[PDB]
């Protein structure tokens, strides 16, 4: 069972990291270092974005040094899905990593 809008099988999309100033200028919201934005700029022709239901999911990067996949972000929020001039926001895993350590390593790390 499935329709159109809600996909039948898992979906993928590779997105470019956008620089902090551009992300800030793209929204009226008080963005924070704890979040980053990604997506193609309007001057790029390529589309693609996370949308409702993708929340909580991972934004990963494959390292060219060692060939491991790292989780860089968590699908957090955005203003609609794939609007030109808008960028999807993601929690900053490396920046919140110390907290992740503390709770996994029994409230200490």
């Amino acid at each position: 069972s499935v329709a159109e809008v809600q996909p039948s099988v898992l979906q993928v999309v590779n997105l470019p990291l956008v620089e902090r100033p551009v992300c800030k200028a793209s929204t009226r919201i008080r963005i924070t270092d704890n979040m980053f934005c990604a997506g193609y700029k309007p001057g790029e022709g390529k589309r693609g974005d996370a949308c409702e239901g993708d929340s909580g999911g991972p934004f990963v990067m494959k390292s060219p040094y060692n060939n491991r996949w790292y989780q860089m972000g968590i699908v957090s929020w955005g203003e609609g899905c794939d609007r030109d001039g808008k960028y999807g926001f993601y929690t900053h895993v490396f920046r919140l990593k110390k907290w992740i350590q503390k709770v996994i390593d029994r409230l200490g790390s």
Partner: protein, 150 residues
């Protein structure tokens, strides 16, 4: 996901599906970062604006899935949560700052060709990989387009 494509099977072995016991439904995405710990957004569980406060007994975690809809016999592992941890400085009102939460599984899951944990960045990797222009990858069973529809 908008403008994405069907994923090859086993493409994202760390992909977890946050699901609700009752009524049954897809709640969010998540990532297996080890055999016992799952990472997800704090708003997936706690978002007062939409009257959302799921506790441990409302959610199931489905790992190893490909299809959004069907129950995948051989590959899928459904699990229950032992604990839930929402970041203490999570800000849902103002800006959704610190939108991070950890789900502790009842007991460690069993890795497979379809169930494998992702790495968490470390200082060096963060510094080398996180540059504007560089691409990352997003996966999910979310909607394909903005809604005016179901």
């Amino acid at each position: 996901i908008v403008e994405g494509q069907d994923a090859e099977v086993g493409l994202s072995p760390w992909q977890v599906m946050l699901f609700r016991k009752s009524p049954q439904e897809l709640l969010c995405g998540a990532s297996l970062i080890s055999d016992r710990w799952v990472l997800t957004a704090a708003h997936c569980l706690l978002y007062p604006p939409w009257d959302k406060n799921f506790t441990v007994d409302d959610l199931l975690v489905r790992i190893g899935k490909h299809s959004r809809t069907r129950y995948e016999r051989k590959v899928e592992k459904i699990s229950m949560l032992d604990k839930i941890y929402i970041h203490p400085r999570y800000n849902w009102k103002e800006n959704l700052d610190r939108d991070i939460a950890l789900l502790k599984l009842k007991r460690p899951i069993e890795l497979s060709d379809y169930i494998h944990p992702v790495c968490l960045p470390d200082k060096q990797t963060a510094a080398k990989l996180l540059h504007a222009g560089f691409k990352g990858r997003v996966t999910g069973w979310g909607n394909r387009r903005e809604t005016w529809t179901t």
